[PDB]
C-alpha cells in the first residue's frame, strides 16, 4: 500500500525560499513520475510541476517557471519541491503525486500519469510578523488580529463542549487572521454557571483565558 | 495547451444519480482525462482514467457506482445510488505536452439531509474592543441546510461594501451548515448612525437583524 | 574473456596415426558468446584420442602474408633467439651483437638490524 | 497478435538474443492501456536489457488497477500477482471483440478464494477443491467447500468493466550479461568520394571513402596498417570493401616575386589536387595564378619537383 508524506512548509516572507519534500514509500519510486499540485485556500486544483523517473525530464506549470525547482533523489525515494522569490499567491496546500508513464498517440510523446495523492502540506508566504491575538466577547469569544494560523478555542478548559462551534479563520486585508468561537447555552444558566474560552497560540506563546458575562 | 470545461455546481439528492460533465475544448478533442475526487477537508483522491472510445481503467478501491462515458469532445463521470459520502468537488485532469491541466471543478452537493433555514444572531461592538479603538460587528449564522448563503450589511438602509469578511460555509456536529460575518468599522462610524443590518439570503429567503448603539 | 566465451577452432587433414603433425596453422574465431559464466574446470563429451593444453600470458609476433593470414610466429619467451627476433621485430636476425633482456640479481632474505639492547629498564625492580 | 492465455498460469515468454521493434509497439492505436513502469515508452529504443519477460494473461476492467507495484484484489492476490518493484511496461487493451461469447465465455477463470497471495510471477496451477471450513471436501463441492477459482461471465453485451483486457507485462531485467536484446539501430546512406565525419559499427573517424581493392577474410572487420591506423572497413550491409583515405590537407604557401615589382602572386596548395580546391596541377601540388611554359630557364623561386616559377614579361 503505496503513500507519499509531504515534508513542511508554513510561513516564510515574501521572496524568500522554501524546499517542500515528499516521503515515498511502497513503490518502486525510481520507475515512476512524480508531480507537485497546490491548492489555494478556497481555489481549485493548479498544477505545479512533474518530473521523469529518469533522465530528468522536468516540466512546470509558467506561473512558477524560474522560480520553482523539481527534483528528485532516487537513492533516497525522496521528491523535492524548491520554490523560490516566494510570493503571497503562492499560498497554498501543497499535494505530491504519482503516476507511471505512456505514449499517448495524440501528443507522439510521453504523458505523465497522475493516480496517486499525497497529504499535502501548508505554504504561507506574507509580510506579517507573528502577533498574538485580542480576545474579545448564544455567547462567544471574537478572537482578532492574529498571525499566522492556527489558534484553538476550548470552553471552560474543555469541560464544555456542547453547543461550541469555533468557526474558520477570516483573512482581513490587514494581513491578520480573525476567527470566532460561540456556544449557544440554556438562557436561565447564565446567573449560575461562568463561561470562559480558552484561546491558545502557539506561534507567539500567546495563551488568553477570557470570560463571557452579560 | 488543452482547456477542461466543468459546470461550476450540480446537486441531486440521495440515492439519485448525477452524470458530472467535463467538455475538453474542441481543439485538442478526443484528448484522454481523469477524475479525481476531493471530499471535504480531505485530500484528493484518482477515481480513472477516460479514453475517447469510452474506455476506463479504475484506480483500485473505488466502487462500481462510478462510471465514466465518452462522447464528442465531451466525458461525464456518473456516479448511481448516491450516498453521503459522495458530495465532494469533482476534478477533471488531462495532459498536454509534458504539462497537465485541470477543471474548475464541480460541487457536487447532496440535498437528502433536511432542509432548514438559517439562525442570525448578530453582536454589536463589545465595550471592551471600543475602549480599544475598534468596532468589529459579528455576525453569526448557523444550522442552515444546504450550506449556501449570501450576506449583505447595510448602514441605515445603505449597503456597506467596505470593512466586510464572511467564512464560507461548514457543517456543525449535528450535521448542519454555519457561517460567520465580520464588519470592521472606526468607532467615530459606529457611533454617528442609528442602525447596522446584517441581512442573510438562504434559497431566495432573507433573514434581517439590526443592532443600534445605545 | 571479459564475459564472452570465444571458441576458435580449426579443421586440417591428418596424415600421422599417433602424433600432433609439426605444421602451423592459426585459428579462426568461431564464436563469441555473450554467457557471464565463470569457468574453472571443464568436462569433455564423447559417444579415439585427445590433447589439452593450457593457455598462458605470452607475447608472440605473428607473420602475415598478403592475404590477411598468419602464416609463421615467433615465441618471444622460447629461447634467446626467439627473443632476438622480437627485440629486432624481424624473422630473420642479421649478423651481430643486439642487447635483447636485462638482467638483475634479486635479493633473497630481507635483514633489519637494530643494535644490541642493553641498559634495560628497571622492571625487574617491581614487575619481575 | 495478443492472444494472451489464462491468469492463474500466466504465459511467461522470455526475449533474449533479438532486436525489439519497439516501434511498432509504440506507433499503433489499437490500445488503451500503456502503462510503463521505470522506463520511458518513448525512449524505450535506447534501453538495452538482458532480459525481456512477456508475461499473457486476460484481466477485467477494474482489476487493471491491481496490475501494478503494490496492488492487492482478487486477481492481484489470489492470481497474477506484481513485485512492489516490477520494471517494465502492461500493454492492455478490450477484447471484447475477440475472446467474449454470446453465452459467456467461462474458459477464462480468476483466483476468488485462496490460502495465500501469489509471489511475483509465480504461476500456481493447482485444482483441488478449496476447503473453506474444517470439514473435508473430498471432491464435493458444498458449504465451506468453494472451488478455487470462478470464471467470468464475458458476453458481447456485457458492460467495459466486465469485458476481457488482453495484458501483457514487458519485465526489463539487467543481470550481469552483455544484454542482448535491444532495439533497431538507425542507419544511412554511404557517402563515396567526399570528406565524410564516418561511423561504422565501432570504427569513427573522418575521411573520403572509396572503393577497395583488397579482399578481406571472412571474418575481418576492418583492416589497420603498419602504424596501427584504420585504412579500410566492411560496409556493415552490402559487403563491400571500402578504403579510407586522410582528408586532404596541406600548407599553403604564396610564391611571389617581391611586392617591389608587383603584387601579383601566385598560390601553391601542397599536395592537393585541383579538384579539390591559371590553374596548373603540378607533382608538388596545385599552383594557381602561373601560366605554364615549354621554354627553360634558370631555376628562379623553387616550388619543388623540378618545377620553378619566374616573373616575365
Ligand atoms: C568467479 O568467482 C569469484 C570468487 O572469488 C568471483 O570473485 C568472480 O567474480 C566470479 N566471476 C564471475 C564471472 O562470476
Ligand atoms: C592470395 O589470394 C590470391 C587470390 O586473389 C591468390 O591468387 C594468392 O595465391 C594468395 N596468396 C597467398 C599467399 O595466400
Ligand atoms: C652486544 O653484545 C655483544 C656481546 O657478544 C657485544 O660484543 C656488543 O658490543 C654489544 N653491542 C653493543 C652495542 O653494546
Ligand atoms: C586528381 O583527381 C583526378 C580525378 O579524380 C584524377 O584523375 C587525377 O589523377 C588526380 N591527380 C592527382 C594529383 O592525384
Ligand atoms: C610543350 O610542347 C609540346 C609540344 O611541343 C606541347 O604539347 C605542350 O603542351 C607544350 N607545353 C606548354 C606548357 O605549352
Not at chain 1, 502540506?121 to 466577547?137: E, R
Not at chain 2, 440515492?15 to 484522454?32: D, E, P
Not at chain 2, 477516460?50 to 462500481?64: A, F, M, Y
Not at chain 4, 478449496?130 to 467447500?145: D, I, R
Request: proline content about 6%; charged content about 15%.
Amino acid at each position: 500500500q503505496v503513500q507519499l508524506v509531504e515534508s513542511g512548509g508554513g510561513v516564510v516572507q515574501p521572496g524568500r525560499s522554501l524546499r517542500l519534500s515528499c516521503a515515498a514509500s511502497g513503490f518502486t519510486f525510481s520507475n515512476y513520475a512524480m508531480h507537485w499540485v497546490r491548492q489555494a485556500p478556497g481555489k481549485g486544483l493548479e498544477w505545479v510541476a512533474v518530473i521523469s523517473y529518469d533522465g530528468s525530464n522536468k516540466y512546470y506549470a509558467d506561473s512558477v517557471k524560474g522560480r520553482f525547482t523539481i527534483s528528485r533523489d532516487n537513492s533516497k525515494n525522496t521528491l523535492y519541491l524548491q520554490m523560490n522569490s516566494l510570493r503571497a499567491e503562492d499560498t497554498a496546500i501543497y499535494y505530491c503525486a504519482s503516476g507511471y508513464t505512456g505514449y499517448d498517440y495524440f501528443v507522439r510523446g510521453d504523458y505523465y500519469g497522475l493516480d496517486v495523492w499525497g497529504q499535502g502540506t501548508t505554504v504561507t508566504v506574507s509580510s506579517a510578523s507573528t502577533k498574538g491575538p485580542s480576545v474579545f466577547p448564544a455567547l462567544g469569544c471574537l478572537v482578532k488580529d492574529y498571525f499566522p494560523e492556527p489558534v484553538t478555542v476550548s470552553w471552560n478548559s474543555g469541560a464544555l463542549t456542547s453547543g461550541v462551534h469555533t468557526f474558520p479563520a477570516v483573512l482581513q486585508s490587514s494581513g491578520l487572521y480573525s476567527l470566532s468561537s460561540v456556544v449557544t447555552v440554556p438562557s436561565s444558566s447564565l446567573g449560575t454557571q461562568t463561561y470562559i474560552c480558552n484561546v491558545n497560540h502557539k506561534p507567539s506563546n500567546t495563551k488568553v483565558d477570557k470570560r463571557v458575562e452579560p | 495547451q488543452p482547456v477542461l470545461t466543468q459546470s461550476p455546481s450540480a446537486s441531486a439528492s440521495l440515492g439519485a444519480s448525477v452524470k458530472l460533465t467535463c467538455t475538453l475544448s474542441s481543439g485538442h478533442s478526443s484528448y484522454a482525462i481523469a477524475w479525481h475526487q476531493q471530499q471535504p477537508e480531505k485530500g484528493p483522491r484518482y477515481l480513472m482514467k477516460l479514453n475517447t472510445d469510452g474506455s476506463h481503467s479504475k484506480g483500485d478501491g473505488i466502487p462500481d457506482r462510478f462510471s465514466g462515458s465518452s462522447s464528442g469532445a465531451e466525458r461525464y463521470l456518473t456516479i448511481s445510488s448516491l450516498q453521503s459520502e459522495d458530495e465532494a468537488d469533482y476534478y477533471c485532469q488531462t495532459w498536454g505536452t509534458g504539462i497537465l491541466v485541470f477543471g474548475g471543478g464541480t460541487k457536487l452537493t447532496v440535498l437528502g439531509q433536511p432542509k432548514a433555514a438559517p439562525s442570525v444572531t448578530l453582536f454589536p461592538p463589545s465595550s471592551e474592543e471600543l475602549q480599544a479603538n475598534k468596532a468589529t460587528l459579528v455576525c453569526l449564522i448557523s444550522d442552515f441546510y444546504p450550506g449556501a448563503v449570501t450576506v449583505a450589511w447595510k448602514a441605515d438602509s445603505s449597503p456597506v461594501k467596505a470593512g466586510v469578511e464572511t467564512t464560507t460555509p461548514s457543517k456543525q456536529s449535528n450535521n448542519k451548515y454555519a457561517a460567520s460575518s465580520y464588519l470592521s468599522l472606526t468607532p467615530e462610524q459606529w457611533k454617528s448612525h442609528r442602525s447596522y443590518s446584517c441581512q442573510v439570503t438562504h434559497e431566495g429567503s432573507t433573514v434581517e437583524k439590526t443592532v443600534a448603539p445605545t | 574473456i571479459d564475459g564472452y566465451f570465444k571458441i576458435y577452432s580449426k579443421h586440417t587433414p591428418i596424415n600421422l596415426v599417433r602424433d600432433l603433425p609439426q605444421g602451423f596453422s592459426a585459428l579462426e574465431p568461431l564464436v563469441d558468446l555473450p554467457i557471464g559464466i565463470n569457468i574453472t574446470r571443464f568436462q569433455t563429451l564423447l559417444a579415439a584420442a585427445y590433447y589439452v593444453g593450457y593457455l598462458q600470458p605470452r607475447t608472440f609476433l605473428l607473420k602475415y602474408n598478403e592475404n590477411g593470414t598468419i602464416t609463421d610466429a615467433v615465441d618471444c619467451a622460447l629461447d634467446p633467439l626467439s627473443e632476438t627476433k622480437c627485440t629486432l621485430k624481424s624473422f630473420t636476425v642479421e649478423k651481430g651483437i643486439y642487447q635483447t633482456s636485462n638482467f638483475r640479481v634479486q635479493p633473497t632474505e630481507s635483514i633489519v638490524r637494530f643494535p644490541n639492547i642493553t641498559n634495560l629498564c628497571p622492571f625487574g625492580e617491581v614487575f619481575n | 497478435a495478443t492472444r494472451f492465455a489464462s491468469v492463474y498460469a500466466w504465459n511467461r515468454k522470455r526475449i533474449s538474443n533479438c532486436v525489439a521493434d519497439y516501434s511498432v509497439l509504440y506507433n499503433s492505436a489499437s490500445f488503451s492501456t500503456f502503462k510503463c513502469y521505470g522506463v520511458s515508452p518513448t525512449k524505450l529504443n535506447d534501453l538495452c536489457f538482458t532480459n525481456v519477460y512477456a508475461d499473457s494473461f486476460v484481466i477485467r476492467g477494474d482489476e487493471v488497477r491491481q496490475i501494478a507495484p503494490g496492488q492487492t484484489g482478487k486477481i492481484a492476490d489470489y492470481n497474477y500477482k506484481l513485485p512492489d518493484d516490477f520494471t517494465g511496461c502492461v500493454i492492455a487493451w478490450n477484447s471484447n471483440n475477440l475472446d467474449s461469447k454470446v453465452g459467456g465465455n467461462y474458459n477464462y477463470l480468476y483466483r476468488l478464494f485462496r490460502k495465500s497471495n501469489l509471489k511475483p510471477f509465480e504461476r500456481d496451477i493447482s485444482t483441488e477443491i478449496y476447503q473453506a471450513g474444517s470439514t473435508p471436501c473430498n471432491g464435493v463441492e458444498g458449504f465451506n467447500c468453494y472451488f478455487p477459482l470462478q470464471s467470468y461471465g464475458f458476453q458481447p453485451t456485457n458492460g467495459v468493466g466486465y469485458q476481457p483486457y488482453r495484458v501483457v507485462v514487458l519485465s526489463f531485467e539487467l543481470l550481469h550479461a552483455p544484454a542482448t536484446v535491444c532495439g533497431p539501430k538507425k542507419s544511412t546512406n554511404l557517402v563515396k568520394n567526399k570528406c565524410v565525419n564516418f561511423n561504422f559499427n565501432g570504427l569513427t573517424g573522418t575521411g573520403v571513402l572509396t572503393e577497395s581493392n583488397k579482399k578481406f577474410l571472412p571474418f575481418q572487420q576492418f583492416g589497420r596498417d603498419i602504424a596501427d591506423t584504420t585504412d579500410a572497413v566492411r560496409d556493415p550491409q552490402t559487403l563491400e570493401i571500402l578504403d579510407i583515405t586522410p582528408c586532404s590537407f596541406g600548407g599553403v604557401s604564396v610564391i611571389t616575386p617581391g611586392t617591389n615589382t608587383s603584387n601579383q602572386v601566385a598560390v601553391l596548395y601542397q599536395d592537393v589536387n585541383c579538384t579539390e580546391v591559371n590553374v596548373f596541377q603540378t607533382r608538388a601540388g596545385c599552383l594557381i595564378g602561373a601560366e605554364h611554359v615549354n621554354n627553360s630557364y634558370e631555376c628562379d623561386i623553387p616550388i619543388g619537383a623540378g618545377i620553378c616559377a619566374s616573373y616575365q614579361t
